[PDB]
């Protein structure tokens, strides 16, 4: 049962819940890859990898995956939460000399990870690792967008942290910009196209349809995050939060930053029902009888598809990971799944 002020009827009604058919196999193999990366020690990987459904949300996401891609994906994605600890962490002990190192030896890894395998830092390894396999499966022009991207996403990242050590809450807008890059909207998006075995032409992926479904999308998944991690957030002196920056900046009260929040959620999943119908038909469009036409309309159609099943996935998600629940712990300041 979901809780009232998280609640939202048109996802669980409209959203059908969609399952990776190789997703116990993707549990299974991204634990023993944590624990082989050594991201996270034996003990609490035994006791919380699991329960934190890393493997479960991208599983639900990335519908149509080849098995490898999705494998790569899920190690990429659970790297990428344990970054955000690693990343709060440093904040938290105000380790800012080993920050900014990790920054910098993560833009490195990013454009030639072949070299960091076996780097030092085990956080850096395992990057490279994920990274240089999700490099494998699409031309080198995909891989230089992700690269683009990701350095954007590095830097918003560090941009973060020195909020935080500022005590800087950001304004509305500025953190509706930046969430857009700490999300990681278009590294999601990126990951889509080897999903369905695909490079898309920017002719295709920059259709106004395409583009806005495909925002529209990760929106509703980084505010939701929000929605559902504030309290998680507040308890850690995290000021990254779309509510936050509400209580902080327009003088609303947490019950209206929270109200606020679910309204701009909600109306993220109507604008994307319109705007799906006009990708949709994009996609229809592409199919113009030609064997490049139907690999391009397909390609599409599985995208569109899975940026709808980001919708479900995430939503259930932050009620199935034992990373938002809060309310568990002992020190509601620190997650024990995080290295303190
Ligand atoms: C650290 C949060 N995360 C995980 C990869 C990176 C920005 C986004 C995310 C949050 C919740 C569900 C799915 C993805
Ligand atoms: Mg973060
Ligand atoms: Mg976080
Ligand atoms: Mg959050």
Redesign the pocket.
Same mark, same amino acid.
């Given at each position: 049962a979901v809780p009232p002020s998280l609640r939202l009827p048109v996802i669980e009604a409209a959203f059908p819940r969609q399952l990776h058919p190789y997703w116990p196999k993707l549990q299974e193999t991204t634990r023993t890859w944590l624990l082989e990366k050594r991201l996270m020690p034996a003990d609490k990987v035994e006791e919380y990898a699991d329960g934190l459904c890393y493997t479960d949300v991208m599983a639900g996401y990335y519908l149509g995956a080849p098995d490898e891609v999705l494998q790569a994906i899920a190690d990429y994605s659970a790297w990428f939460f344990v970054w955000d600890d690693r990343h709060d962490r440093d904040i938290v002990h105000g380790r800012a000399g080993a920050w900014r190192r990790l920054r910098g030896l993560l833009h490195t890894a990013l454009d030639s990870p072949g070299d960091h395998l076996h780097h030092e830092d085990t956080l850096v390894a395992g990057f490279a690792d994920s990274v240089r396999r999700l490099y494998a499966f699409l031309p080198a022009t995909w891989n230089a967008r992700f690269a683009r991207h990701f350095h954007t996403v590095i830097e918003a990242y560090d941009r973060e942290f020195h909020n935080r050590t500022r005590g800087i809450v950001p304004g509305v807008e500025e953190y509706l910009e930046l969430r857009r890059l700490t999300?990681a909207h278009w590294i999601w998006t990126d990951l889509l196209e080897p999903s369905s075995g695909c490079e898309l032409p920017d002719a295709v992926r920059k259709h106004p349809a395409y583009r806005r479904a495909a925002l529209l999308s990760q929106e509703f998944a980084?505010w939701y $995050?929000?929605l559902?991690?504030?309290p998680? !957030?507040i308890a850690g002196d !995290?000021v990254? $939060?779309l509510g936050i920056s509400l209580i902080t900046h327009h003088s609303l009260t947490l019950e209206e930053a929270i109200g606020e929040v679910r309204r701009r959620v909600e109306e993220c999943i109507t604008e994307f029902l319109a705007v799906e119908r006009d990708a949709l038909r994009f996609a229809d469009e592409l199919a113009d009888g030609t064997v490049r036409g139907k690999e391009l309309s397909g390609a599409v159609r599985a995208n569109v598809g899975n940026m709808r099943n980001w919708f479900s996935s995430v939503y259930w998600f932050h009620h199935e990971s034992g990373r938002?629940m809060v309310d568990s712990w002992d020190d509601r300041s620190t997650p024990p799944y995080v290295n303190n």
């Open positions: 999300f980084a $995050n929000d559902c991690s504030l998680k !957030e !995290e990254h $939060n938002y």
